[PDB]
Design a protein around this ligand. Structure first.
Ligand SMILES: *[C@@H]1O[C@H](CO)[C@@H](O[C@@H]2O[C@H](CO)[C@@H](O[C@@H]3O[C@H](CO)[C@@H](O[C@H]4O[C@H](CO)[C@@H](O)[C@H](O)[C@@H]4O)[C@H](O)[C@@H]3O)[C@H](O)[C@H]2NC(C)=O)[C@H](O)[C@H]1NC(C)=O
Ligand code: HEM
Ligand SMILES: *[C@@H]1O[C@H](CO)[C@@H](O[C@@H]2O[C@H](CO)[C@@H](O[C@H]3O[C@H](CO)[C@@H](O)[C@H](O)[C@@H]3O)[C@H](O)[C@H]2NC(C)=O)[C@H](O)[C@H]1NC(C)=O
Ligand SMILES: *[C@@H]1O[C@H](CO)[C@@H](O[C@@H]2O[C@H](CO)[C@@H](O)[C@H](O)[C@H]2NC(C)=O)[C@H](O)[C@H]1NC(C)=O
Ligand SMILES: *[C@@H]1O[C@H](CO)[C@@H](O[C@@H]2O[C@H](CO)[C@@H](O)[C@H](O)[C@H]2NC(C)=O)[C@H](O)[C@H]1NC(C)=O
Ligand SMILES: [C-]#N
Ligand SMILES: [Ca+2]
Length: 595
């Protein structure tokens, strides 16, 4: 009868039970079990982990060991045979803007992070793995199958280190291995404010009592703010262009500089905080720095949750929306708010949503310059493109004018992400995001496709033909059986994404359920949900109810014409109205008088 409380958390906890403000670590949300939902804990397990030795070794690790009698297919081969395509034409989503894809990636980073192994700074293990592809300890290489063009020019494999686990980090033994989530489970803008105390401070400008966030001092975007630079030397952002020498941005989440389009959206959120903070000082002169900070931070969290639940989710889940996420009835303390381990693979559906190029537009929304459209792979960790070439304006107009890529059973993930991904650790633009995702399901001990179909109460197909009826595709179904011999071994990631989309949504029956469940759970179990009585005032909520991403753009950039429904496909200029016609956030209900 094993122990029921192990770990390596964030220490000195002590809950206030009276603060009207969230903590940084996510600690103290739930009054009865204070660590539920906090950062640095094991992700949750909706079903028992499935490992080779039933404890920690992933499937595919030991050659002679099968998964249900069959050999698990190489990640990169599942990638080459099923996930890739050449023809980028016709791939776009006719009714989903490029913002549809990008917002998913924030929410996501707001919710979950499974850091890689870390016993290696002054390392020979990063090369012991990089160079001779020897699998061992925390090195779990993605071998290249025969006939992979990459053997000819890259090597024999791709570095892939196992995610971190829970009580220590040095080679564990007891219970089943559990991966850590380095961020808070709640939708609380933890990506703009940091999940650690240690960070949530550095990011602030305590040089003054205005409760603002620290901005950069070396470069400006038309009088508007940029994010502070990161001092750590290595820089991946420096690497992609040693002539420009522009480090990556410093923010609440470490993945901020992954991609020119993700660092930009971060800029908008920082700007909104600093913006909320001065509008507030100007209405409550007596408020101190800590108060402008916490109150502005409580407003931005309300923001992230409203756009996510009101505008985003209804168009992912589509017709499945009301089956999993019922109308809000109040804070349930019996609800486990933790991000489940499978959620982090289920939300990966967004990877099939990333388009092959990224565009920049000028004031009239026409191409901005001679090289306005750029291949997605040149934008990974690219901060110099924002700083020495236009600011974030030309890039936000692209967010609104361009479409997302539509998941397609024959065109899953762009080569830009399948063969030219840049990993912040190593030096080349030659990684495969898809193989990484697949190798990662195994790392996390994920149960096969049919266990989840069973979890969601859906038909578990055990035959080629059965798989054909579920996926409604003979050829896809056929290729799957060939590499997996049984739908029982189909990895949840490619498993859930190969299913056709639901009515008016963007994911299949399986993903909608895994998704819907997790999202019904972080809302009902959040003692600080914006609608939970007493968190804000009846008058405040009336103001918050008017948030819109359009307004966010209007108040934090110099765009003057924006769509009224940013997430759908908007053609310029019919669909574009003037900022004057988009509801402003009335901050009057936040005024305060003492007597
Ligand atoms: C807060 O969240 C809680 C956690 O999700 C919720 O509690 C769960 O819901 C109920 C409590 O009301 C528990 O059981 C449900 O209700 C019946 C059992 O008490 C079941 O009905 C019938 O089930 C079988 C069918 O197989 C019948 O044969 C049987 O006769 C019975 O009448 C329901 O099917 C269901 O089990 C449930 O176990 C609780 N679970 C947990 C994990 O807590 C609750 O909804 C929320 N609280 C409030 C106030 O809303
Ligand atoms: C570059 C990358 C992106 C932009 C082109 C991108 C985009 C997304 C979207 C749109 C997502 C959902 C809506 C989404 C979810 C998650 N991703 Fe992904 N992603 C890029 C690159 C990566 C890399 C690299 C990883 C690391 C994978 C690994 O296992 O090593 C990655 C992961 C995830 C992820 C899991 C987060 C976690 O808990 O660790 C998502 C929920 N993405 N991305
Ligand atoms: C690395 O970053 C460099 C900038 O930090 C970048 O060079 C810059 O980009 C081009 C040169 O290729 C020039 O931009 C355009 O605009 C100027 C001014 O209007 C014109 O004179 C030019 O015709 C040009 O079209 C920049 O002036 C140039 N700046 C510098 C300092 O070089 C490199 O392209 C980047 N290298 C890689 C490999 O990405
Ligand atoms: C593009 O997406 C929007 C958003 O869903 C579609 O319009 C919505 O349709 C839903 C039906 O589920 C209605 O509830 C709303 O009236 C619409 N929402 C908004 C914000 O307008 C729109 O029709 C889609 N375009 C196409 C061709 O399907
Ligand atoms: C902290 O806030 C102060 C202002 O409250 C910032 O300094 C000001 O900002 C600019 C940039 O130099 C200039 O207008 C003045 O130099 C300063 N104005 C005032 C009124 O002091 C300072 O840059 C902020 N610190 C950080 C790290 O962002
Ligand atoms: C994905 N980030
Ligand atoms: Ca969070």
């Amino acid at each position: 009868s094993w122990e029921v409380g192990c770990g390596a958390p964030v220490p000195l906890v002590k809950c206030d039970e009276n603060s009207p403000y969230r903590t940084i670590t996510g600690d103290c949300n739930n009054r009865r079990s204070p660590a539920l939902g906090a950062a640095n804990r094991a992700l949750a397990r909706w079903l028992p982990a499935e490992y080779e030795d039933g404890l920690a070794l992933p499937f595919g690790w030991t050659q002679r060991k099968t998964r249900n009698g069959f050999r698990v297919p190489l990640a990169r081969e599942v990638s080459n045979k099923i996930v890739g395509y050449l023809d980028e034409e016709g791939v776009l989503d006719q009714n989903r803007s490029l913002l549809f894809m990008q917002w998913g990636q924030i929410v996501d980073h707001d919710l979950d992070f499974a850091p890689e192994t870390e016993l290696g700074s002054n390392e020979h293990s990063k090369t012991q793995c990089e160079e001779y592809c020897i699998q061992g300890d925390n090195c779990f290489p993605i071998m290249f199958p025969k006939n992979d063009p990459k053997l000819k020019t890259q090597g024999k494999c791709m570095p892939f280190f196992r995610a971190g686990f829970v009580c220590p980090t040095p080679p564990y033994q007891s219970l089943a291995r559990e991966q850590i989530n380095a961020v808070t489970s709640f939708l609380d803008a933890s990506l703009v404010y940091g999940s650690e105390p240690s960070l949530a401070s550095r990011l602030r400008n305590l040089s003054s009592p205005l409760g603002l966030m620290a901005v950069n001092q070396e470069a400006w975007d038309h009088g508007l703010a940029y994010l502070p630079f990161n001092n750590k030397k290595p820089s991946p952002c420096e690497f992609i262009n040693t002539t420009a020498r522009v480090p990556c941005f410093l923010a609440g989440d470490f993945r901020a500089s992954e991609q020119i389009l993700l660092a930009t959206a971060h800029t908008l959120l920082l700007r909104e905080h600093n913006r909320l903070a001065r509008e507030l000082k100007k209405l409550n002169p007596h408020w101190n720095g800590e108060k402008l900070y916490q109150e502005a931070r409580k407003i931005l969290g309300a923001f992230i949750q409203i756009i996510t639940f009101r505008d985003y989710l209804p168009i992912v889940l589509g017709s499945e929306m009301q089956k999993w996420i019922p109308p809000y009835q109040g804070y349930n303390n019996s609800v486990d708010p933790r991000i489940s381990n499978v959620f982090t693979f289920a939300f990966r559906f967004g990877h099939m949503e990333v388009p092959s190029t990224v565009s920049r537009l000028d004031e009239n929304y026409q191409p901005w310059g001679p090289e306005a459209e750029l291949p997605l792979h040149t934008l990974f960790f690219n901060t110099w493109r924002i700083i020495k070439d236009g600011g974030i304006d030309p890039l936000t107009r692209g967010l609104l004018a361009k479409k997302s890529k539509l998941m397609n059973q024959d065109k899953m993930v762009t080569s830009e992400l399948r063969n030219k991904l840049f990993q912040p650790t190593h030096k080349i633009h030659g990684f495969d995001l898809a193989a990484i995702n697949l190798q990662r399901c195994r790392d996390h001990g994920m149960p096969g496709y049919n266990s989840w179909r069973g979890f969601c109460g859906l038909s578990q197909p055990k035959t080629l033909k059965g798989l054909q009826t579920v996926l409604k595709n003979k050829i896809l179904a056929k290729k799957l059986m060939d590499l997996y011999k049984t739908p029982d071994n189909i990895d949840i990631w490619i498993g859930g994404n190969a299913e056709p989309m639901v009515e008016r949504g963007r994911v299949g029956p399986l993903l909608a359920c895994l998704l819907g469940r997790q999202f019904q759970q972080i809302r009902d179990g959040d003692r600080f949900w914006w609608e939970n009585p007493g968190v804000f005032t009846e008058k405040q909520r009336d103001s918050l109810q008017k948030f819109s991403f359009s307004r966010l753009i209007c108040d934090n950039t110099h765009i003057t014409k924006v769509p009224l429904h940013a997430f759908q496909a908007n053609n310029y200029p019919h669909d574009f109205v003037d900022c004057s016609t988009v509801d402003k956030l009335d901050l009057s209900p936040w005024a305060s008088r003492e007597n």
